[PDB]
Amino acid sequence: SGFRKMAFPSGKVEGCMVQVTCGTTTLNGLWLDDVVYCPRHVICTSEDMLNPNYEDLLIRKSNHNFLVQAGNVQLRVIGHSMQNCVLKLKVDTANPKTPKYKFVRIQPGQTFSVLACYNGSPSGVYQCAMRPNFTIKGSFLNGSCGSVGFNIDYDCVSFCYMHHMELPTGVHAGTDLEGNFYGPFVDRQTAQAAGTDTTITVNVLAWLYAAVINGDRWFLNRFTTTLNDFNLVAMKYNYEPLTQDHVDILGPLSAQTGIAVLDMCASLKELLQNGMNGRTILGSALLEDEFTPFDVVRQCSGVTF
Amino acid sequence: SGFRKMAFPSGKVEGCMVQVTCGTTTLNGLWLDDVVYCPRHVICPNYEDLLIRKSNHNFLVQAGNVQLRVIGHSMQNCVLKLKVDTANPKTPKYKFVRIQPGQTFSVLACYNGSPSGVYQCAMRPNFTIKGSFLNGSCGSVGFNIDYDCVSFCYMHHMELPTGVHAGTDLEGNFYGPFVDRQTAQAAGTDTTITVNVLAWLYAAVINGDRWFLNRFTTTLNDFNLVAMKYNYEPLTQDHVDILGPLSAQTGIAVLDMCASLKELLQNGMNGRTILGSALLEDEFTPFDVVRQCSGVTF
Numbered sequence: 001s002g003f004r005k006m007a008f009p010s011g012k013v014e015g016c017m018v019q020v021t022c023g024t025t026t027l028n029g030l031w032l033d034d035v036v037y038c039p040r041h042v043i044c045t046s047e048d049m050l051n052p053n054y055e056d057l058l059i060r061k062s063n064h065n066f067l068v069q070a071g072n073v074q075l076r077v078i079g080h081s082m083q084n085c086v087l088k089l090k091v092d093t094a095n096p097k098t099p100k101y102k103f104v105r106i107q108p109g110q111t112f113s114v115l116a117c118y119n120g121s122p123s124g125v126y127q128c129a130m131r132p133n134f135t136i137k138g139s140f141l142n143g144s145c146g147s148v149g150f151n152i153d154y155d156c157v158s159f160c161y162m163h164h165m166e167l168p169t170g171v172h173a174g175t176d177l178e179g180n181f182y183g184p185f186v187d188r189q190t191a192q193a194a195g196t197d198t199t200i201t202v203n204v205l206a207w208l209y210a211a212v213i214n215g216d217r218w219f220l221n222r223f224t225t226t227l228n229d230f231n232l233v234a235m236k237y238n239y240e241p242l243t244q245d246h247v248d249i250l251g252p253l254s255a256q257t258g259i260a261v262l263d264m265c266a267s268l269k270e271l272l273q274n275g276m277n278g279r280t281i282l283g284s285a286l287l288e289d290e291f292t293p294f295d296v297v298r299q300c301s302g303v304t305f
Numbered sequence: 306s307g308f309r310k311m312a313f314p315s316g317k318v319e320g321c322m323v324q325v326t327c328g329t330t331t332l333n334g335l336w337l338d339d340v341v342y343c344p345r346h347v348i349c350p351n352y353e354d355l356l357i358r359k360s361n362h363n364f365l366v367q368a369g370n371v372q373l374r375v376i377g378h379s380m381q382n383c384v385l386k387l388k389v390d391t392a393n394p395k396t397p398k399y400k401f402v403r404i405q406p407g408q409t410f411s412v413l414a415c416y417n418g419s420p421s422g423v424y425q426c427a428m429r430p431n432f433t434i435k436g437s438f439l440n441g442s443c444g445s446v447g448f449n450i451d452y453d454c455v456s457f458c459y460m461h462h463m464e465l466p467t468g469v470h471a472g473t474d475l476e477g478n479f480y481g482p483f484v485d486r487q488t489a490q491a492a493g494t495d496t497t498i499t500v501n502v503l504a505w506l507y508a509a510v511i512n513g514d515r516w517f518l519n520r521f522t523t524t525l526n527d528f529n530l531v532a533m534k535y536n537y538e539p540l541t542q543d544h545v546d547i548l549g550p551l552s553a554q555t556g557i558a559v560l561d562m563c564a565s566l567k568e569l570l571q572n573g574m575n576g577r578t579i580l581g582s583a584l585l586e587d588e589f590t591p592f593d594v595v596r597q598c599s600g601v602t603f
């Protein structure tokens with residue numbers, strides 16, 4: 001019993017964190033095999049950030065301008081290339097702690113663990129979701145650039161995010177491990193703002209099924225809804241549209257609890273209309289949207305209470 | 306910017322998790338040097354009567370794919386210590402520490418000696434923890450990391466009928482009035498950790514949330530008379546002193562913030578949130594707030 005925002009054990013990722021320095025800029029890098037991946041803005045000054053020409057800044061650099069520190073050992077850079085917004089530094093030593101890994105690009109609504117690092121040293125781990133507006137509500141200070149997001153499955157680490165910047169609203173933007181940004185953001189200090197954020201509907205539904213599994217049904221009602229009527233109501237509360245794919249994905253949770261997806265949608269509609277009336281759901285007074293259907297199945301018991 | 310329930314990096318603890326099996330019972334053990342520590346209920350009660358009927362070969366200890374050989378066994382309170390023939394090469398620098406209610410720690414939840422998740426939690430004033438544990442989680446450990454030294458403070462034993470959790474320090478002494486056996490056990494009425502709610506209100510002010518601040522102050526006694534009515538733990542002079550740094554960083558006196566908390570208890574939040582929450586959060590200590598708003602690494 002219980003329901004917590006659970007992160008993956010971070011050990012496999014801790015053994016990959018290194019410190020990368022170029023001139024006066026210092027940030028984190030991910031050391032996998034003989035390559036260190038880090039944000040390309042390590043080659044920038046603060047002035048350069050307004051309109052940086054990364055190709056012009058990179059061509060003026062040699063291998064020995066990049067200082068890479070792994071623990072107390074200095075790694076030697078023997079090559080460098082840029083791939084989108086990520087710099088790839090070829091080093092002379094393969095990481096003996098390299099786990100089994102994949103680079104995966106995630107979609108909005110998907111969750112992942114973040115290992116927040118400063119000076120190549122991990123400081124904390126937390127769980128978060130890729131918001132529909134492609135930002136993440138993380139906890140990052142200056143020097144956290146290069147910190148990574150990941151999931152773990154059967155000892156294979158799937159790297160999905162690398163931290164690049166904080167937007168004026170305090171939210172965070174970054175790239176996949178191929179250097180392609182999530183969202184319409186650029187690694188430029190330009191007037192860019194996150195789009196209006198929305199609630200991840202399929203995740204709120206999954207969390208309502210998690211509450212049922214753990215023994216709570218106060219919020220259920222005798223009504224059902226059509227998918228279209230649910231979406232017309234949900235859009236009014238800034239909730240993301242629920243698609244047939246979402247309904248299909250909620251199938252296992254519907255079978256484990258005996259509650260049809262459109263019946264759970266009718267309960268969500270009523271919760272949006274009435275609020276919680278001094279009651280909580282899994283220890284929360286707000287409708288939680290950072291647990292996916294997969295996360296609920298992973299954390300919760302296979303036997304409903 | 307941002308404020309999250311952050312756990313310590315779990316790597317140093319992952320390298321200590323093993324699976325312990327005795328008869329039909331399987332649970333998690335902590336392998337430090339040549340000793341595996343695990344809950345004594347693995348032998349299940351008259352524990353030193355069940356223990357004398359066991360030999361070393363009855364305990365199967367599995368570290369990854371390797372089988373460790375047990376060469377000795379002894380009991381310390383509710384914890385069983387299994388002497389093994391191999392010292393853990395991944396043993397970190399460590400201490401066993403007993404924490405007090407209100408203190409927080411990271412939990413590495415394991416099943417069959419394999420870590421599955423890490424989360425942060427607090428020791429409640431009623432000595433229980435609101436964790437997320439399923440059957441097979443026994444022996445999962447709680448810890449804090451301070452300068453590459455891991456301080457082990459909790460070992461999971463059981464779940465109470467309300468869904469909350471109970472366990473011991475690493476010396477086998479239970480937190481709370483509990484026993485390791487199937488009997489009528491219930492957690493006492495819980496209270497809110499006041500010094501932690503105040504620390505989290507300071508974290509909100511640091512993060513640019515100030516709607517709840519007011520021009521008023523209060524005495525410590527008047528605050529405690531009000532707080533006692535909402536099932537909040539009494540705030541002591543020690544708590545005020547501990548909040549001193551946060552009071553100086555934000556310019557808001559502790560008793561000045563106590564007057565904001567009093568108004569929040571008496572009026573609610575009025576449809577507003579604080580750090581994305583509609584409830585007053587009490588699982589961040591003053592030290593957790595300072596650490597997360599500073600950048601301390603391990």
Ligand SMILES: CNC(=O)CN1Cc2ccc(Cl)cc2[C@@]2(CC(=O)N(c3cncc4ccccc34)C2=O)C1
Nearest residue numbers: 041140141142143144145164165166187188189306
């Ligand atoms: C909030 N941003 C700024 O004050 C200026 N920043 C412009 C800028 C523009 C583009 C890019 Cl790709 C990087 C960056 C910087 C580089 C950097 O370290 N960050 C940060 C990252 N995460 C969290 C932070 C929290 C506080 C202060 C800085 C943070 C940035 O956003 C710097």
Ligand SMILES: CNC(=O)CN1Cc2ccc(Cl)cc2[C@@]2(CC(=O)N(c3cncc4ccccc34)C2=O)C1
Nearest residue numbers: 001346438439440441442443462463464485486487
């Ligand atoms: C609720 N538990 C029971 O019905 C039986 N339990 C007797 C028992 C008696 C003494 C001791 Cl010290 C432990 C235990 C068990 C062993 C064990 O793994 N647990 C559990 C731990 N965490 C979370 C759990 C979630 C669901 C079911 C069991 C959980 C127990 O409490 C099992």
Ligand SMILES: [Cl-]
Nearest residue numbers: 105106107110
């Ligand atoms: Cl995805």
